[PDB]
Write a protein that binds this ligand. Structure first.
Ligand SMILES: Cc1nc(N)nc2c1CSCC2
Ligand SMILES: Cc1nc(N)nc2c1CSCC2
Lengths: 207, 207
């Protein structure tokens, strides 16, 4: 069973803005996604402070960056809190409707697209480089789900049958002209430029 | 009944570092606290998306900055998620132990104290300007509590008997040489410099 949902109008407009606005500095997508993974790791860590069982689904708190040139995908994996089905549907646990508004009003008063993260919607920056994003996620309180969207106003959710234990994988199916983000040295440069001080180990996988 | 608690050793060391390190750019405290209030507002907003009753305790989502020259206090008030007694005790809902470590290791690789917020412990930057901080908070799931600390290794928690509905008030009892932060024009400059794009209205109260 694949369920198809309409994005809320503001989210669709946000995504359409991210996709069609000329904006060369695309590399910030990776900072935003790593920061999202970092927040999710903080969240499961905080919960585990008072209930260690919350880590039964996996004790290690990390972020993996996985490029795959043959699939043309870059995958960001964390072992953070993950998302329930309800979270996914509800704009992947973001306040995306009011976030989009504040971001818009910010763009008005001279904000840059690189500030998208300050408004709780940095996830959608994935669309600077990806023609399609697939999000596989497992929260302690729910089954494993796959969310997917090539934008154009709709997304799908289905149950996902390779278990990951707990966390979220963001699979970026890159646009054909953005394969530089599969390059080890390019990924290293960006992680060093924008994610130097993240508090969890970031492992860049080799091909 | 006033209960007195010892800070965890790392938090005490963090606070001692914030208090004793020479660092002129103290104004960042206000950005960090407003950002904390912003995160707390996002949190109650996200919860209300699926359970509007969560806003029975107050529909308006805002931040107030209240200077009081006669008390020598600057108070940051939000109507965000607030904190339970357990949250307060557990380092005001922060991952302060692992946050402090990452911040330390960041200070090692050439981080600045202004980056404290990236590590989930920007609250403690209050101690750049305050000799004492009192935190009054009300979470939907608990009573209203007052947390207090002049640092020196301990904090107190007690039940608080002026109801606020829902949210958190951070009362900064300013050091005697930091009263510039009670000045309307100084507060305006800082809010404009560092908090321009916050997604909730910030009201600077007049005396
Ligand atoms: C829990 C979580 N994890 C990751 N990696 N990304 C997101 C969420 C929910 S917030 C924005 C997207
Ligand atoms: C919920 C909340 N509100 C505010 N204002 N400050 C804090 C928290 C909990 S996180 C860091 C301190």
């Amino acid at each position: 069973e694949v369920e198809t949902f309409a994005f809320q109008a503001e989210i669709a407009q946000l995504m359409s803005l991210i996709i069609n606005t000329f904006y060369s500095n695309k590399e910030i997508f990776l900072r935003e996604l790593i920061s999202n993974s970092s927040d999710a790791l903080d969240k499961i860590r905080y919960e585990s402070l008072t209930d260690p069982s919350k880590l039964d689904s996996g004790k290690e708190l990390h972020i993996n960056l996985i490029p795959n040139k043959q699939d043309r995908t870059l995958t960001i994996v964390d072992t953070g809190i993950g998302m329930t089905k309800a979270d996914l549907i509800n704009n992947l646990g973001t306040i995306a409707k009011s976030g989009t508004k504040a971001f818009m009003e910010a763009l008005q008063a001279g904000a840059d697209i690189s500030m998208i993260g300050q408004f709780g919607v940095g996830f959608y920056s994935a669309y600077l480089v990806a023609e399609k994003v697939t999000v596989i996620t497992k929260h302690n309180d729910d089954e494993q789900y796959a969310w997917e969207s090539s934008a154009g106003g709709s997304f799908t959710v289905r149950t996902d049958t390779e278990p990951m234990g707990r966390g979220t994988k963001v699979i970026l199916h890159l646009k054909e002209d953005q394969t530089e983000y599969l390059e080890e040295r390019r990924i290293k440069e960006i992680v060093k430029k924008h994610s130097q001080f993240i508090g969890y180990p970031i492992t860049l996988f080799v091909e």
